[PDB]
Amino acid sequence: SAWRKAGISYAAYLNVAAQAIRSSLKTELQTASVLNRSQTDAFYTQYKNGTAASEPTPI
Amino acid sequence: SSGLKLQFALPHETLYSGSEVTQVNLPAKSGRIGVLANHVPTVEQLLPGVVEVMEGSNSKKFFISGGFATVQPDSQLCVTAIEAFPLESFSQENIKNLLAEAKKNVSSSDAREAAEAAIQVEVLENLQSVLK
Amino acid sequence: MQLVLAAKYIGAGISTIGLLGAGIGIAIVFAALINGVSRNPSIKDTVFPMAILGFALSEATGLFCLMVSFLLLF
Amino acid sequence: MQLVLAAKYIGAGISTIGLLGAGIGIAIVFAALINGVSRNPSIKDTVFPMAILGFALSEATGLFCLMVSFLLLF
Amino acid sequence: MQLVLAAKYIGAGISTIGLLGAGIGIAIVFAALINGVSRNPSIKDTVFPMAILGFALSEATGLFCLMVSFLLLFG
Amino acid sequence: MQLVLAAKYIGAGISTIGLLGAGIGIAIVFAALINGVSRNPSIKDTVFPMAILGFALSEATGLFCLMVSFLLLF
Amino acid sequence: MQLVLAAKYIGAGISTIGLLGAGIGIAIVFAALINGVSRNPSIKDTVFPMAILGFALSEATGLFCLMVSFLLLF
Amino acid sequence: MQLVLAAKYIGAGISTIGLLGAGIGIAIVFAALINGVSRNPSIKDTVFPMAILGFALSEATGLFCLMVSFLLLF
Amino acid sequence: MQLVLAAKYIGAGISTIGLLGAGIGIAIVFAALINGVSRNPSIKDTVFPMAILGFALSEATGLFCLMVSFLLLF
Amino acid sequence: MQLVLAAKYIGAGISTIGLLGAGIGIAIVFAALINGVSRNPSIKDTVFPMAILGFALSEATGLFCLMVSFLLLF
Amino acid sequence: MQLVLAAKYIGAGISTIGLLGAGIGIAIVFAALINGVSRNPSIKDTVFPMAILGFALSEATGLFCLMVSFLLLFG
Amino acid sequence: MQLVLAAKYIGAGISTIGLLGAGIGIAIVFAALINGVSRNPSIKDTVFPMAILGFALSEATGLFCLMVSFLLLF
Amino acid sequence: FYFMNQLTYGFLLMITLLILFSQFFLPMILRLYVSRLFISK
Amino acid sequence: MLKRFPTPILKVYWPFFVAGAAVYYGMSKAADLSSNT
Amino acid sequence: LTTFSLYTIIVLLVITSLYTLTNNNNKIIGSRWLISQEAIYDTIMNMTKGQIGGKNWGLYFPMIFTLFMFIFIANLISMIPYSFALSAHLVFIISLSIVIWLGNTILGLYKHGWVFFSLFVPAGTPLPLVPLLVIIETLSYFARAISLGLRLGSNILAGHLLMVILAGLTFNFMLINLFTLVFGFVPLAMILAIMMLEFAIGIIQGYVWAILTASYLKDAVYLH
């Protein structure tokens, strides 16, 4: 569908498609690698040098 | 160059690093194009589809999760991928349908999230087409 | 009837021309069908009946012209 | 009177030329419809009714030509 | 008089073929409308009233050819 | 007074033949408008007056053919 | 009958133009075929019978023009 | 004399048929300008004058047809 | 018997208009062929046979029109 | 002399049709020029001249047709 | 004796219009050749002989109608 | 006598229409040339000689039409 | 044929419109421009 | 409101005016030549 | 006082009673009438920059404005079935085109002299191609001037007569049919459509005339 205006960017669209393949992958294919791909614990702070601190926004 | 070489790679592990190929299917935004030898340099977006790697051994298929199909004038086919469809073990109907039904509920949650949800449902239906 | 029959014959001959449009109709309907199916295999099943209806109606128009040309003959 | 009916038949035959428009019009309408439906199946439901309406209007122009030819036949 | 009416008839018949151009014009307008709505579903609401306008203009030209044929017939 | 009037009518018809090009032209200009605005939603205000102007040009072209027809009518 | 025969000949000559449209239509169908197979060589087998059917339907217009011309002549 | 004026009228009418191409031409010129502004909105100012130039040239063709028709008339 | 033979001359001359369609059909099949070969250098071995076959099918209409013109002449 | 001048006028009216082709041709040349310049602003300087010359003598073809019509008139 | 030559001239003149389609078809073949050469400079060796063959073949198609007009004139 | 000259003039006028195809063809040749040089400027040097060659070939077809019209006149 | 009191009168009409526009409402539009310009400052 | 701020009325509009005058001289003689009354 | 002259008096009566006869709020707004012409005034003023701009676009602005006003007003009240619009002759529209061209060249000949002849050769077209281009360019200069005048007047004539011709048909239809209903309102429906077209076309053709006369002014002042 629309991922530029309706979505965010091609990167987000591709990441959602990859998460689609990984999460919908069959049981025997599931391993530690796909768990790490699913795992995401980044925090977006966006340091307020002037202003606009995002305060550890979750990934 | 002699035939075509395919650099099909996945971030967990590369699939092909220039292996000689008899013919490549590249389901793209416009449509799949068969590149097998020489051809012209091209840049193109790989829509989620079955990138079947036809070879003299067998015509093994792979459903891509997305990428870019680009061609170099030296008969080079650089296909960058993320997640493949190994043979047919990738097929799992129940969880695909479960994700499609459970998350189409949030297909109208919030602009960007809603659009990404609809896109993921669409690629799940693409997998269902690959499910056979 | 001399002039009348002459005009009827030439009228049928000139009414024959609607087959041009009927043929172009069928032809580009099939051409677009070919392009679409070659660009997408799955959509072939759902685009085939639409093309069927399209050239069926084009041939119906051609048949209308054929009928009008025929009545000028008999 | 003989020339009157003769040219009446000639005029009907030459008025039937307008069906070329109806034919290649439904042609190009269905070609665009095939292209659009093959582009993405989602738009098919929205695009089909107006394509059918356009077919109806093009063949309505063709039917206008046919009716005027009919007036030059009876 | 007979030849005058005969010429009126054939002139009307030849003038009728403006409906050919009217139909092709409306057809190409609808074809562009189809392509636009397929490529950009959002632009459909912006382009539809314009498409109705263009349809009306082309069919007006064709209908006016029809009235030219009518006035050749009855006048 | 007979043959001259007949040829006047025939010339009027074969000059009314001219509106075909005007209709096809206005329609294709507007079709280009459709495609351009569909690809680029932000260029509508820039391209709409241009396409309307091209419309007026082609319509005045067909109206010129129409006037050439009228001078052989009254 | 003499002028009737002359008009038969001229009307047959007029009616023989439909093969123009038949040939141009079958040729645009073939052009779409070859463009599609150039894009996707795998769809060639699927598009072969549909395109043959489209060719036959397009040439049906030329066949109808032939039978009209034959009726005009004999 | 009467046949001379009759053929003058029919020659003017059949001279009128050369301006459909002028209309189609100015139309496709404006259509290409719409397409180009769609692709390259910035280049519109540079590219516009050639549109009017081509319009003037095709209108010159159409009024050459007019000149033939009018000299055939008066 | 001069009028019937004159009209068959006229009809044979008219029958030679299908050359337009035959030539443009050969043209479009070869044009799409050359475009596909240039864009896909490795598709020639399978497009050339069907390209020639489509050319022959297109030329069928033209040769038939010339044959009927010849039989009208003789 | 009556029929001679009559058919001279008819032939001139038929001959002036070349401006249709001249206009269509110069317009397709302009359309390609605009498309290329919008797609390639840098090419404008080196694509202007032969385009200018080409549509110039494409108009010269219609001018030759107009001159044939002139000699038919005079 | 006059109507026969008159119709010979008429038939030849209405046959001459056949070369129109032949010429435009030759040139559209050539246009696609230009497009293919531009989109693939390395394909010229393969595309030139086939395009020349299509040229000469459409030219023969037009010239046969030209010969028909010539036999209408002088035969 | 005078009828022969009249038909000669009308045949030359009808033959003059043969230049339309030459114009449309030469113009489409330069149109593709413009598009190609706009795509890649490097191709212009290797296409210009054969481009003007095909140009002159279409012009030669048009000149054949004009020469047949002239030998009709003279 | 009849041209005396129309074409010369047409250019006189253009002159009158020229006066009543460029001397009256062009200064009016300009005056509101500069008026609000100095209103800000 | 109607405050008359001077603007070009005749200083630069002379060419079309003298063209009109040159038209006028001859523009009445054309009617005189083709009187047909 | 011919029909042309009395019509011309009616034109100026309407002209003054839109913007000259409001003149009371001492503001830029306060009457939607004022918003109307300044909208048109701004559309042509920015158009004057876009077409004539660079040295003297505002110098020649009023003529394009006055001509656009003249065509605009003459096309507004032209639909009523008894509109004897512009004497049904429209010969002055040709005359306006003739004088506009004739003034255009004198400005060109005054501002360029012999250089005005260099306009026929824009960029290339060498000596073998010089006579062909100067013939096309010079004949074109006559060509679009006469075409501009005839196209506007004829279509106004064409529009006015297609008012009457269709109207007579409606009179025939409403007199013959006894009890049915679909015989006269559909012809009335086309009358409603064909009148909107004639009103519409006059608006744009006035704009087209405004753009065209602007376009020829560029060629006179600027050589290309």
PDB file of N, CA and C in Angstrom, chain N residues 1 8 12-16 18-20 22-23, chain O residues 23 59-60 62-63 99-100 102-104 106 110:
ATOM      1  N   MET N   1      -8.714  57.422  -2.751  1.00  0.00           N
ATOM      2  CA  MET N   1      -9.936  56.827  -3.277  1.00  0.00           C
ATOM      3  C   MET N   1      -9.942  56.983  -4.797  1.00  0.00           C
ATOM      4  N   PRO N   8       1.532  56.833 -16.636  1.00  0.00           N
ATOM      5  CA  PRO N   8       1.579  56.957 -18.102  1.00  0.00           C
ATOM      6  C   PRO N   8       0.222  56.763 -18.763  1.00  0.00           C
ATOM      7  N   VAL N  12       3.845  56.676 -23.366  1.00  0.00           N
ATOM      8  CA  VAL N  12       4.371  55.430 -23.911  1.00  0.00           C
ATOM      9  C   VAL N  12       3.339  54.694 -24.756  1.00  0.00           C
ATOM     10  N   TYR N  13       2.112  55.211 -24.841  1.00  0.00           N
ATOM     11  CA  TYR N  13       1.031  54.555 -25.567  1.00  0.00           C
ATOM     12  C   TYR N  13       0.824  55.155 -26.953  1.00  0.00           C
ATOM     13  N   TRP N  14       1.762  55.983 -27.406  1.00  0.00           N
ATOM     14  CA  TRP N  14       1.722  56.636 -28.710  1.00  0.00           C
ATOM     15  C   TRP N  14       1.734  55.686 -29.912  1.00  0.00           C
ATOM     16  N   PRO N  15       2.498  54.580 -29.919  1.00  0.00           N
ATOM     17  CA  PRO N  15       2.573  53.795 -31.165  1.00  0.00           C
ATOM     18  C   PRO N  15       1.238  53.220 -31.599  1.00  0.00           C
ATOM     19  N   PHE N  16       0.466  52.646 -30.675  1.00  0.00           N
ATOM     20  CA  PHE N  16      -0.848  52.133 -31.049  1.00  0.00           C
ATOM     21  C   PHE N  16      -1.797  53.257 -31.445  1.00  0.00           C
ATOM     22  N   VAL N  18      -0.936  56.189 -33.005  1.00  0.00           N
ATOM     23  CA  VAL N  18      -0.610  56.606 -34.365  1.00  0.00           C
ATOM     24  C   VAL N  18      -0.938  55.495 -35.355  1.00  0.00           C
ATOM     25  N   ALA N  19      -0.827  54.233 -34.935  1.00  0.00           N
ATOM     26  CA  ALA N  19      -1.295  53.132 -35.768  1.00  0.00           C
ATOM     27  C   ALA N  19      -2.792  53.244 -36.020  1.00  0.00           C
ATOM     28  N   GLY N  20      -3.556  53.577 -34.977  1.00  0.00           N
ATOM     29  CA  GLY N  20      -4.982  53.779 -35.149  1.00  0.00           C
ATOM     30  C   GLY N  20      -5.299  54.922 -36.093  1.00  0.00           C
ATOM     31  N   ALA N  22      -3.343  56.057 -38.555  1.00  0.00           N
ATOM     32  CA  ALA N  22      -3.001  55.589 -39.892  1.00  0.00           C
ATOM     33  C   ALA N  22      -4.065  54.640 -40.424  1.00  0.00           C
ATOM     34  N   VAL N  23      -4.663  53.838 -39.541  1.00  0.00           N
ATOM     35  CA  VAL N  23      -5.803  53.021 -39.944  1.00  0.00           C
ATOM     36  C   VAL N  23      -6.957  53.913 -40.377  1.00  0.00           C
TER      37      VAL N  23
ATOM     38  N   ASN O  23     -16.997  53.022  -3.867  1.00  0.00           N
ATOM     39  CA  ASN O  23     -16.164  54.150  -3.442  1.00  0.00           C
ATOM     40  C   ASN O  23     -16.583  54.812  -2.130  1.00  0.00           C
ATOM     41  N   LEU O  59       4.357  48.905 -17.852  1.00  0.00           N
ATOM     42  CA  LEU O  59       4.138  50.018 -18.769  1.00  0.00           C
ATOM     43  C   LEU O  59       2.973  49.731 -19.708  1.00  0.00           C
ATOM     44  N   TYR O  60       2.934  48.528 -20.278  1.00  0.00           N
ATOM     45  CA  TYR O  60       1.912  48.145 -21.243  1.00  0.00           C
ATOM     46  C   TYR O  60       0.767  47.358 -20.619  1.00  0.00           C
ATOM     47  N   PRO O  62      -2.085  48.321 -18.968  1.00  0.00           N
ATOM     48  CA  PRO O  62      -3.492  48.717 -19.167  1.00  0.00           C
ATOM     49  C   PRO O  62      -4.122  48.238 -20.466  1.00  0.00           C
ATOM     50  N   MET O  63      -3.385  48.209 -21.582  1.00  0.00           N
ATOM     51  CA  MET O  63      -4.001  47.802 -22.844  1.00  0.00           C
ATOM     52  C   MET O  63      -4.515  46.372 -22.765  1.00  0.00           C
ATOM     53  N   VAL O  99      -5.872  46.208 -35.961  1.00  0.00           N
ATOM     54  CA  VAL O  99      -5.186  47.360 -35.384  1.00  0.00           C
ATOM     55  C   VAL O  99      -4.196  46.925 -34.309  1.00  0.00           C
ATOM     56  N   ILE O 100      -4.511  45.863 -33.562  1.00  0.00           N
ATOM     57  CA  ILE O 100      -3.576  45.375 -32.551  1.00  0.00           C
ATOM     58  C   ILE O 100      -2.290  44.883 -33.206  1.00  0.00           C
ATOM     59  N   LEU O 102      -1.250  45.793 -36.259  1.00  0.00           N
ATOM     60  CA  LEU O 102      -0.635  46.902 -36.982  1.00  0.00           C
ATOM     61  C   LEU O 102       0.139  47.807 -36.029  1.00  0.00           C
ATOM     62  N   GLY O 103      -0.409  48.040 -34.836  1.00  0.00           N
ATOM     63  CA  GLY O 103       0.345  48.739 -33.809  1.00  0.00           C
ATOM     64  C   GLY O 103       1.522  47.938 -33.292  1.00  0.00           C
ATOM     65  N   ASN O 104       1.389  46.609 -33.258  1.00  0.00           N
ATOM     66  CA  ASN O 104       2.471  45.760 -32.771  1.00  0.00           C
ATOM     67  C   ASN O 104       3.716  45.894 -33.638  1.00  0.00           C
ATOM     68  N   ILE O 106       4.538  48.473 -35.813  1.00  0.00           N
ATOM     69  CA  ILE O 106       5.104  49.821 -35.749  1.00  0.00           C
ATOM     70  C   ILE O 106       5.957  49.979 -34.500  1.00  0.00           C
ATOM     71  N   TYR O 110       9.656  50.609 -34.930  1.00  0.00           N
ATOM     72  CA  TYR O 110      10.230  51.779 -34.270  1.00  0.00           C
ATOM     73  C   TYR O 110      11.363  51.378 -33.333  1.00  0.00           C
TER      74      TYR O 110
END
